[PDB]
């Protein structure tokens, strides 16, 4: 009868393969609604 969650218990002296690699996952999504996340030039005359 096991408790699911187990702790990383990070330490600063471990390897580069056991050290906290923060992660961010960006998903871009497209519905039948007005898209608004549009993410981005000089003037001359005569």
């Amino acid at each position, epitope marked *: 009868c*096991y408790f699911p969650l*187990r702790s990383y218990s990070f330490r600063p002296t*471990y*390897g580069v*393969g*056991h050290q906290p690699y923060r992660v961010v996952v960006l998903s871009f999504e497209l519905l039948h609604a007005p898209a608004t996340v549009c993410g981005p030039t000089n003037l001359v005359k005569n």
Partner: antibody
Amino acid sequence: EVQLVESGGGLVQPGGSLRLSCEASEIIVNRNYMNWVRQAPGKGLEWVSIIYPGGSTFYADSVKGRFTISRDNSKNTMYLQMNSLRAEDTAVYYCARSYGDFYVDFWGQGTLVTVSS
Amino acid sequence: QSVLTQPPSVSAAPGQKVTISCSGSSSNIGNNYVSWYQQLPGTAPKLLIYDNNKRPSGIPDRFSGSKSGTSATLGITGLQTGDEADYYCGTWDSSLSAWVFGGGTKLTVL
């Protein structure tokens, strides 16, 4: 009492096919991470295959592709489909429960396997 | 190429502490957890030490396990006759994505 008992071991010709089986009591094979490990006479336990709760399988390098691990729907028993044998598959296969990926808590008694004519 | 290396044999007389060293590349034993198994003759491996130091389910005491850098050490105060078996060290090599075991020591009591 907890126990895992395995059958299906005997003489077989090179290139044959077997269905070894792991029967689980007191425990439920469709949940605990189950493992097939081997040891040729005079040799060292070598990881053959691990079955995850969610159905995912992992196999070693030497034992890739030819083999297959499977988890019964209702019989509370797991099976190894050994196919395309060679000389280096002479073994005493064991099935063992492994908390996560950390340590192998329970080991079955042992089922000889021989590849010769 | 990662497969932990273990001395072919270790021997001591009763009353003398026995030390076994399992060494491997820091790909698997420097980033994951060692565990130590005992195989009595003609039987099946019995878990002995898990999670780098612990001793499960009331194993006979004086059995100790430690981890130093890229190595692991098992220790038995004295060399009792009943402890004669093969000893293996296992870690989950993520590079190979596979359990990797040591060579195995033939502990003989002098």
